[PDB]
């Protein structure tokens, strides 16, 4: 396995950004996940070499940090907050609306690999509960009609 | 410059300081910041000795806005008694439930934070500073990267800043999903490219932090005060609010209020005033049952008249106000808090590791009506025994709020028994 | 809390403009957002202004203020002229029998606001106005509050939703003059002056507020704009007949069982408005006449006309004042004469003296104190209000009365003896 | 000399700062003045002109033009009665009669206590609810004298 040159260039920028290469590990893993829609297991050995770190170190880090997903490829990650404020204000309504539109529940991917619902802890937008993200974009859920229109923006 | 979508959190200020620009929900760039007199505090700072800046921040009575309320000036003094090099870290990991005060500064007025980081760094003799921002704030990350470049272009960062001989680079690091990486020592481990495992304290970071060197870690909101202290002087700063607990404070208010949002208020304000005077009262004008101070404390409706200060009888914490009303099931709410700690213990310490897990696992059974008598007794036991041998604050408090609900709402718990 | 407003009945077969406004209460931004509100604006901001103009043109939307000028074409005229440009929402609604616009304002203000924002973007206006008549104080307070809600949610201000588009909406109040709904008098009033219409051409789109390109559009017109963008112009054009497409509001009053505002397609006939929708006549008396505000008088032989902007159609505002067999047409004509007497601005001599004399002499006729000369004088004056007039008031101050003279000669004759 | 009380002056300054140009606030200011005093005091016009940076005769002409403003009669509550076509058809005269029975005044007149003035106005844009009146900013359908009496009892 080998990184495409456009991605490798991007990883090199991160590695060169901080004073020490190993500081770039999380920026690198975000970049990888952005590129592939998940963390390819085969990507870690080459990344470890670029960071001048042992492979097991890199594996331990991927395992520790909940945002990284080595299991499921998805184009769009719908992160749904399931913490206290969103729960009080209507996480379950958002989840039901998502099941109506997409036919999936938290932890599942659509068969086309387009959407995965990820249950997450407080997203720091609790005044706008219930909160969800679609990749980097963040939104307040208002209603199913509203949600349907938002999701239609992601092709 | 296109940024990811951010919901437009309502913000309101009686003081017009931290939210002078951030009360408007958009990015304020360097030109607008400069038009409002920004970066003149930095210029003034660079004409001062580091020693004097520390003195002013000390005399301002500024206390840590990350939640513990440690005196900021004292923290800095401790760092500078130790040989360099030294590092300055802005903690932007903000992941406590209910807490969204720091992001509005980052996303709407980044230069206020940047200006604060430069002054603070100069004060402690750090030439290398960091912002560690949680991974779930991607817009904040790009906004900060862009603002740093703006600051560089105007000569507020780099070598020999404004001819002072002071050098600074600010690096922006991203988290990747761990609440624990907001704990200052786990944050440092993460900056060093490792898992977010807290270290035994002492030593405190000011003695031994990043690469073992003296390191000051301060919260976004703490740092955002620094430009005001320099701009107005410490005397004028103390005239804001009560003289013991001076300065503006941000209060993220959520849950069952009419106007959820961030409020900039003085800390003599009461909790009752926050909910009713500022946040518009309760949804449906229902009675307040409880306020959760993030995931730390639970206040009952008999405790609304307390001041929002760092006094022993005060609200304290981060200023986070999650309002529950008369219909909200306290056991259901306690389960959500239990689930949070279950998901975020790093697992280094055995009672924290097993305790956070079992607290959540048993409370779910209780909630679902499937708990045996031994499950009930076990729940009580585990809740009281998460803390022993813990080396950070998560283990120390993972049972705290839940215990308070057990003591303050016995009627509702007994109904589940 | 807002001033008391009568609860005008509203009914829709289309569920568009009256989807919320069929319920007689203020719908605030959260309710609007729940129904998908402001998503059309988000869509619009991802389109070019030129595209938006194209869609509004192809929709067939015509001016709902009464003249039926094609809206997209009006916008195109504006944008061929150099900026800055201004956008004005005309909420002066003061035509007798006309209360269609106020129910949008007072019940679903965000529909109007969303429309204003999209329209302003389309024509490159960064400053927009609502001019609301002084006798709608509640509408004014409701709009001011709604605009602040829109600001809170980032739909107004600078750099709206990262688009780079800036907009402020200012709410001005009238103070008693019907003529200030004439678009040029409205502009004079916005400039701080008496409501004196300007010689046209130039039209506002060439020379308007502060002499700059200005679009004036009616409340109802603007309320259509979110639908055109949301549905697309083709789907919008499926509503009603393809040559006069879209929802229309019909304010129905007088001797009907169910007076109120009806949202209906424009292929609806006048007879259907009265009998199918408005419940027929009070006491099931025969229809004698329908006044289209103060503009036209239709007889009972003219009820099978379409409620569209065709030459043989009802046209106007869609205002339907029903008179039945026992209502004295000369008494009714007097009230129309009194209206125009009260509202001429007096700049033009035949309008000034003609509106006055028409009313003065018709009162004498009505009271049986008219000489033969007064009769002949009334006829002459009625035919001679229009010459030299620079606005539509003088053009039509004799129109409805003349139509009653032609359509109800027997009633008038009874007065001439 | 005449000066605006600070509470009023403050409100006038908000209006004047609201629009991009000061002169655009003229009607909002005059509404505010009439709200405060129960009419437009002639003496108020010169200070307002100064605040708007307009000549006095400009302000005077604007007050004269706009029918809502009243320089003659102080009244705490203005009962605006619609006298246009629909309300006329549906019972304006019944409403006027009821008002005379309760208050003892006709259109154009003020009660002896200065509490109520009846103002005849053109179509108020609530014609489906004819006959229509306003009491200051509040607006109502007239149903009957007993009902009107109850409505008016709320204005003290
Ligand atoms: C904002 C947010 O998302 C969260 C905030 N928190 C807050 O974190 C707080 C606990 O933090 P910590 O365990 O760091 O508190 P502490 O009291 O041990 O120390 C606070 C600060 O003072 C310094 N400090 C304390 N004693 C010191 C000493 N003797 N010498 C030097 N520095 C000292 C210490 O290094 C830290 O920066 C709680 O009150 C929570 O409110 C927790 C989780 C998430
Ligand atoms: C709703 C309400 O209370 C009232 C409504 N009206 C209505 O006002 C209408 C007359 O309005 P106006 O004199 O403005 O009509 P118009 O046909 O001269 O112009 C209509 C619109 O098209 C524009 N327009 C017309 N010709 C144009 C041209 N050559 N170029 C550019 N714009 C043009 C013009 O600027 C205006 O906005 C009548 O049909 C009434 O029904 C009158 C009084 C009160
Ligand atoms: C589990 C856990 C999590 C966090 C913290 C603590 C613990 C125990 N702390 C507090 C942090 O360790 C430290 O006290 C502050 O960052 C110090 O800065 P101030 O003195 O508040 O300016 C913390 N602080 C902060 O600024 N942001 C955060 O996200 C967190 N998160
Ligand atoms: C005397 C008089 C009074 C008014 C008008 C005309 C005349 C002659 N017009 C029509 C106005 O000048 C203009 O045509 C419309 O406002 C344009 O908007 P639309 O093209 O209908 O959307 C008008 N229009 C409106 O929207 N509201 C109003 O109250 C009035 N009043
Ligand atoms: S107390 Fe808990 S969270 Fe803190 S270091 Fe120990 S196991 Fe980790
Ligand atoms: S036609 Fe009549 S209302 Fe119009 S400008 Fe002339 S005088 Fe004034
Ligand atoms: S609890 Fe969901 S964003 Fe905070
Ligand atoms: S005629 Fe009286 S409100 Fe219209
Ligand atoms: Na270094
Ligand atoms: Na979950
Ligand atoms: Na300023
Ligand atoms: Na520069
Ligand atoms: Na209404
Ligand atoms: Na605005
Ligand atoms: Na009038
Ligand atoms: Na301007
Ligand atoms: Na009215």
PDB file of C-alpha atoms and ligand atoms in Angstrom, chain B residues 64-71 74-75 78-79 91-97 99 101-102 134 179 182-185 201-207 215-219 293 296 316-320 340-341 392-394 397, ligand 1:
ATOM      1  CA  UNK B  64      -9.127  30.075  35.514  1.00  0.00           C
ATOM      2  CA  UNK B  65     -12.297  29.968  33.387  1.00  0.00           C
ATOM      3  CA  UNK B  66     -11.764  26.323  32.459  1.00  0.00           C
ATOM      4  CA  UNK B  67     -13.664  25.374  35.631  1.00  0.00           C
ATOM      5  CA  UNK B  68     -11.229  25.077  38.566  1.00  0.00           C
ATOM      6  CA  UNK B  69     -10.842  28.855  39.060  1.00  0.00           C
ATOM      7  CA  UNK B  70      -7.101  28.745  39.847  1.00  0.00           C
ATOM      8  CA  UNK B  71      -5.549  32.292  40.085  1.00  0.00           C
ATOM      9  CA  UNK B  74      -0.153  32.934  40.443  1.00  0.00           C
ATOM     10  CA  UNK B  75       0.015  30.177  37.812  1.00  0.00           C
ATOM     11  CA  UNK B  78       5.052  29.653  39.288  1.00  0.00           C
ATOM     12  CA  UNK B  79       6.131  28.937  35.695  1.00  0.00           C
ATOM     13  CA  UNK B  91      -6.876  24.771  26.059  1.00  0.00           C
ATOM     14  CA  UNK B  92      -9.659  24.793  23.447  1.00  0.00           C
ATOM     15  CA  UNK B  93     -10.783  21.192  24.028  1.00  0.00           C
ATOM     16  CA  UNK B  94     -14.189  22.371  25.467  1.00  0.00           C
ATOM     17  CA  UNK B  95     -16.101  19.054  25.718  1.00  0.00           C
ATOM     18  CA  UNK B  96     -18.019  19.300  29.030  1.00  0.00           C
ATOM     19  CA  UNK B  97     -21.797  18.681  28.520  1.00  0.00           C
ATOM     20  CA  UNK B  99     -20.455  23.898  27.527  1.00  0.00           C
ATOM     21  CA  UNK B 101     -18.766  29.362  25.722  1.00  0.00           C
ATOM     22  CA  UNK B 102     -15.231  29.002  24.288  1.00  0.00           C
ATOM     23  CA  UNK B 134     -11.174  19.478  19.938  1.00  0.00           C
ATOM     24  CA  UNK B 179     -12.905  14.415  26.459  1.00  0.00           C
ATOM     25  CA  UNK B 182      -9.005  18.567  27.896  1.00  0.00           C
ATOM     26  CA  UNK B 183      -7.304  17.519  31.148  1.00  0.00           C
ATOM     27  CA  UNK B 184      -4.146  19.629  30.971  1.00  0.00           C
ATOM     28  CA  UNK B 185      -1.642  16.730  31.333  1.00  0.00           C
ATOM     29  CA  UNK B 201       0.234  15.646  39.583  1.00  0.00           C
ATOM     30  CA  UNK B 202       2.276  17.110  41.106  1.00  0.00           C
ATOM     31  CA  UNK B 203       4.329  17.998  39.245  1.00  0.00           C
ATOM     32  CA  UNK B 204       2.006  20.651  37.792  1.00  0.00           C
ATOM     33  CA  UNK B 205       2.724  21.640  34.115  1.00  0.00           C
ATOM     34  CA  UNK B 206       4.313  24.926  35.266  1.00  0.00           C
ATOM     35  CA  UNK B 207       7.097  22.768  36.762  1.00  0.00           C
ATOM     36  CA  UNK B 215       4.285  24.911  30.673  1.00  0.00           C
ATOM     37  CA  UNK B 216       1.291  27.154  31.370  1.00  0.00           C
ATOM     38  CA  UNK B 217      -2.063  25.723  30.294  1.00  0.00           C
ATOM     39  CA  UNK B 218      -4.969  28.199  30.287  1.00  0.00           C
ATOM     40  CA  UNK B 219      -8.545  28.025  29.052  1.00  0.00           C
ATOM     41  CA  UNK B 293     -23.416  22.522  36.177  1.00  0.00           C
ATOM     42  CA  UNK B 296     -20.036  18.299  37.713  1.00  0.00           C
ATOM     43  CA  UNK B 316     -18.429  27.885  40.381  1.00  0.00           C
ATOM     44  CA  UNK B 317     -17.447  25.397  37.680  1.00  0.00           C
ATOM     45  CA  UNK B 318     -17.420  26.583  34.065  1.00  0.00           C
ATOM     46  CA  UNK B 319     -20.599  28.657  34.535  1.00  0.00           C
ATOM     47  CA  UNK B 320     -22.515  26.029  32.503  1.00  0.00           C
ATOM     48  CA  UNK B 340     -20.844  10.274  29.466  1.00  0.00           C
ATOM     49  CA  UNK B 341     -18.224   9.200  32.069  1.00  0.00           C
ATOM     50  CA  UNK B 392      -7.082  13.104  37.513  1.00  0.00           C
ATOM     51  CA  UNK B 393     -10.334  15.007  38.080  1.00  0.00           C
ATOM     52  CA  UNK B 394     -12.578  12.723  35.975  1.00  0.00           C
ATOM     53  CA  UNK B 397     -16.085  13.602  40.041  1.00  0.00           C
TER      54      UNK B 397
HETATM   55  C1  LIG E   1     -14.372  23.380  29.756  1.00  0.00           C
HETATM   56  C2  LIG E   1     -14.484  21.889  29.659  1.00  0.00           C
HETATM   57  O1  LIG E   1     -14.780  21.361  28.586  1.00  0.00           O
HETATM   58  C3  LIG E   1     -14.217  21.047  30.846  1.00  0.00           C
HETATM   59  C4  LIG E   1     -13.870  21.598  32.029  1.00  0.00           C
HETATM   60  N1  LIG E   1     -13.576  20.833  33.147  1.00  0.00           N
HETATM   61  C5  LIG E   1     -13.243  21.452  34.427  1.00  0.00           C
HETATM   62  O2  LIG E   1     -11.996  20.956  34.876  1.00  0.00           O
HETATM   63  C6  LIG E   1     -11.936  21.235  36.285  1.00  0.00           C
HETATM   64  C7  LIG E   1     -10.849  20.402  36.930  1.00  0.00           C
HETATM   65  O3  LIG E   1      -9.560  20.725  36.349  1.00  0.00           O
HETATM   66  P1  LIG E   1      -8.172  20.323  37.042  1.00  0.00           P
HETATM   67  O4  LIG E   1      -8.241  18.921  37.505  1.00  0.00           O
HETATM   68  O5  LIG E   1      -7.047  20.748  36.171  1.00  0.00           O
HETATM   69  O6  LIG E   1      -8.189  21.289  38.319  1.00  0.00           O
HETATM   70  P2  LIG E   1      -7.130  21.653  39.459  1.00  0.00           P
HETATM   71  O7  LIG E   1      -7.888  22.369  40.508  1.00  0.00           O
HETATM   72  O8  LIG E   1      -6.333  20.468  39.834  1.00  0.00           O
HETATM   73  O9  LIG E   1      -6.077  22.643  38.767  1.00  0.00           O
HETATM   74  C8  LIG E   1      -6.556  23.757  37.978  1.00  0.00           C
HETATM   75  C9  LIG E   1      -5.387  24.512  37.394  1.00  0.00           C
HETATM   76  O10 LIG E   1      -4.573  25.073  38.452  1.00  0.00           O
HETATM   77  C10 LIG E   1      -3.254  24.553  38.375  1.00  0.00           C
HETATM   78  N2  LIG E   1      -2.752  24.337  39.724  1.00  0.00           N
HETATM   79  C11 LIG E   1      -3.445  23.850  40.804  1.00  0.00           C
HETATM   80  N3  LIG E   1      -2.741  23.790  41.909  1.00  0.00           N
HETATM   81  C12 LIG E   1      -1.496  24.271  41.531  1.00  0.00           C
HETATM   82  C13 LIG E   1      -0.295  24.446  42.238  1.00  0.00           C
HETATM   83  N4  LIG E   1      -0.159  24.184  43.539  1.00  0.00           N
HETATM   84  N5  LIG E   1       0.771  24.919  41.561  1.00  0.00           N
HETATM   85  C14 LIG E   1       0.634  25.200  40.260  1.00  0.00           C
HETATM   86  N6  LIG E   1      -0.448  25.079  39.488  1.00  0.00           N
HETATM   87  C15 LIG E   1      -1.487  24.610  40.187  1.00  0.00           C
HETATM   88  C16 LIG E   1      -3.363  23.264  37.560  1.00  0.00           C
HETATM   89  O11 LIG E   1      -2.116  22.951  36.951  1.00  0.00           O
HETATM   90  C17 LIG E   1      -4.445  23.664  36.549  1.00  0.00           C
HETATM   91  O12 LIG E   1      -3.911  24.441  35.489  1.00  0.00           O
HETATM   92  C18 LIG E   1     -13.361  20.988  36.805  1.00  0.00           C
HETATM   93  O13 LIG E   1     -13.705  21.957  37.787  1.00  0.00           O
HETATM   94  C19 LIG E   1     -14.253  21.157  35.552  1.00  0.00           C
HETATM   95  O14 LIG E   1     -15.162  22.247  35.678  1.00  0.00           O
HETATM   96  C20 LIG E   1     -13.655  19.477  33.058  1.00  0.00           C
HETATM   97  C21 LIG E   1     -14.000  18.852  31.945  1.00  0.00           C
HETATM   98  C22 LIG E   1     -14.333  19.559  30.694  1.00  0.00           C
END
